[PDB]
Design a binder for this molecule. Structure first.
Ligand SMILES: [Mg+2]
Ligand SMILES: [Mg+2]
Ligand SMILES: [Zn+2]
Ligand SMILES: [Zn+2]
Ligand SMILES: [Zn+2]
Ligand SMILES: [Zn+2]
Lengths: 449, 449
């Protein structure tokens, strides 16, 4: 019994050139929205973050993959929607820094405190604040942490580690960039060491590389972090078959999936955007990346297995899933990698909704940490930045532009962006809210102290 | 009691550097949302359009005027929000054209049919479709059309005109660019001539210039459009005191206010953005326009005046208010003008909401016709385009970048964007919708046949 409805189909209902044909609605939505409102407790929370997936990115991706009048069966199917602010702070002044990085933002929703760009799980005075994940676990809930990036990257790291700089991946960088956190200096350790201490039930992503580092102190000095993980009782999996093999994941036997040395392979290949690329160069059709792999689980497969594993815990679970590479390909000004990552996220959202619809007590939230550079501009545009023309599903040309930096990497932007949710407590994302409100929304939905 | 609540306080709750200090919400919003939902018929509708007012635009303006943690008492106060799509169509192919102009988008909300860039009140086969304004009149409702641009501009023109080119301001341009619409060649006439026929109860904006033009055919041949107007019973006003004097406006004595020759003056002045301005030039503090005049009514006063007059109508009213210059100052790469026109619209929204709170049967809508170029970037950004650093209310620097055009005009972008609403039938803007759905929601809310 699907008590709470998801939006089944908001594509254009007919011929886009005729009166009414471009409509996404088929009648009045009052009753359906009323039906979507419940203040019942949530047993579970599934948080889905598209890194750098602002409104522009969602739009670009839908145009390409589904057509202008198409509809993301995952992404767009959430019925309660609003916009949220993600500004960070200046460490020195305490004033807003209008354009956050991935670390400050993730700290925001995972602790409820704003912070400076580059920080993870600490405020501007460098104090540690518990994360929603540490809280959930303290409360007896099963916990999951899933990303396509290296596990040390800002997004997934924010839930498990509190370091003064997001660069502090392992022992080596930590000694140098985060002296105060360094193990050998009496600190809590590097991001990777804290991730191992945090012990979520399920952790799946890339970044095996840093696991080859050896600890500088403590019980496992001299051994590699990979070796400490095994010594600590973690089940290590490194390919989709092994992941599929897992039947249990808990505090006694927690799961650690390391599927790449660095970030996981992107879904789609395309050339990088160029100066006047839309005028000089022919239109691009994105193509599947041969290195993607059958041996490499996709995001939706990771999401599906975590939910399976976590759903066995009777008090409920907290799960965050990251579509990491949307931001990474947006910095690289690679349309194809970018949109291909958003499609990949949409598949993961679909798995989360199928579960929640059935369960009836699951709040699913889909948003981004911040906005990014990409823009959709007219086909004959002559822009100072990098552009590329792409052939969409509609059989038309869309041009994408990246013109926010002369430097090599395209930059984040400060615009407020879409947050959407489904399930109990979802009402709290409607309207204008702040990214820190999301921590409180989650805490409250879960009934956490 | 205003059963229908408006968001009263969505500003950050306390000290932004402390846990929970940046929250916008005071508690759970489920109940409040339940209470904002009604399927009752709307008696009145007030549609407020910020031209080019995408999420980026709202964010920049809020940051500057209200601070990062601030809140627009009008714009941000609408409780039901979503994101809508505004793509246009390619005239030849009927395939989507991902980035719309102001005419195609206005046509979409005003008629319910997608069209080509440059079309007003016609579809891709150059055929006329009735507009919401036309239909409301036909039904006996009072009608209003207000804007700070030239009244012949795309936005206001779309409610009252059907021309193949938005450039067809008057007889002269019409005979040249829209022959088929030319009064002489048997057409409905130029935009201004059709505006005179549509006979809205209240029409307020700029564009006096074109009214000096003389009619080439019809009953008022050889007379200027101004004479034709007074000749057809319009009550002409050209200033605030004249405007204030009006005690009635109706089909018998319709009101026509021409407050300026071209566009009404912008609120705020500032320098244009320049290459490396955030680096090479000092941060800018916007200056009030000394020449904006006490003799020229502000958008909010026109708004307040239109409601008083239209509201005398017992059957109900439809009203359209445009903050036209956000878009034009976005094109001009002028942060101060762009932001100033957003603050200006916010004051108009407040007026609409105040009336709506009290009346109880008013559906109020706030959106934009498409997205724009401006982006909020990091202070030390080195961008290939035009930039400016600004000093905000927080006492920090915000940087704005315009980098999607090498030409002297910064372009529109195709991102989906916020649409927000308050009152009866407002659920219809929640989630993902298309700009065409807005026509259908308004028509059904009012019960127009
Ligand atoms: Mg990330
Ligand atoms: Mg306009
Ligand atoms: Zn990020
Ligand atoms: Zn990034
Ligand atoms: Zn426009
Ligand atoms: Zn424009």
């Amino acid at each position: 019994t699907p008590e709470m409805p998801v939006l089944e189909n908001r594509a254009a209902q007919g011929d886009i050139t005729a009166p009414g044909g471009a409509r996404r609605l088929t009648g009045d939505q009052t009753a359906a929205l009323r039906d979507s409102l419940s203040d019942k407790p949530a047993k579970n929370i599934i948080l889905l973050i598209g890194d750098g997936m602002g409104d522009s990115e969602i739009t670009a991706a839908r145009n390409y993959a589904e057509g202008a009048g198409g509809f993301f069966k995952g992404i767009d199917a959430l019925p309660l929607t609003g916009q949220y602010t993600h500004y960070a702070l200046n460490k020195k002044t305490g004033k807003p820094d209008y354009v956050t990085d991935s670390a400050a933002s993730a700290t925001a929703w995972s602790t409820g405190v704003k912070t400076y760009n580059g920080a993870l799980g600490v405020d501007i005075h460098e104090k540690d604040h518990p994360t929603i994940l540490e809280m959930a676990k303290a409360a007896g809930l099963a916990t999951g942490n899933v990303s396509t990036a290296e596990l040390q990257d800002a997004t997934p790291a924010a839930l498990v580690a509190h370091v003064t700089s997001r660069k502090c991946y392992g022992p080596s960088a930590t000694s140098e960039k985060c002296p105060g956190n360094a193990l050998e200096k009496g600190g809590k350790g590097s991001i990777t060491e804290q991730l191992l201490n945090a012990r979520a039930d399920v952790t799946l992503g890339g970044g095996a590389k840093t696991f080859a580092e050896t600890a500088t102190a403590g019980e496992w000095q001299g051994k590699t972090l990979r070796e400490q993980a095994q010594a600590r009782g973690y089940q290590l999996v490194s390919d989709a078959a092994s992941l599929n093999s897992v039947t249990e994941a808990n505090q006694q036997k927690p799961l650690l999936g390391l599927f790449a040395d660095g970030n996981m392979p992107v879904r789609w290949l395309g050339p990088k955007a160029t100066y006047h690329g839309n005028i000089d160069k022919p239109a691009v059709t994105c193509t599947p990346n041969p290195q993607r792999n059958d041996s490499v689980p996709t995001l939706a497969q990771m999401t599906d297995k975590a939910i399976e594993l976590l759903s066995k815990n009777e008090k409920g679970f907290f799960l965050q899933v990251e579509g990491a590479s949307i931001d990474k390909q947006d910095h690289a000004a690679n349309p194809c990698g970018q949109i291909g990552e958003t499609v990949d996220l949409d598949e993961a959202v679909q798995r989360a909704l199928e579960f929640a619809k059935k369960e009836g007590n699951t709040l699913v939230i889909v948003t981004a940490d911040h906005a990014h550079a990409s823009q959709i501009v007219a086909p004959d545009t002559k822009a100072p930045g990098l552009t590329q023309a792409l052939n969409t599903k509609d059989g038309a040309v869309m041009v994408m532009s990246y013109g926010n930096s002369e430097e090599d990497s395209q930059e984040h932007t400060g615009s407020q962006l879409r947050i959407a949710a489904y399930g109990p407590h979802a009402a709290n994302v409607v309207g204008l809210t702040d990214q820190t409100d999301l921590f409180y929304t989650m805490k409250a939905a879960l009934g956490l102290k």
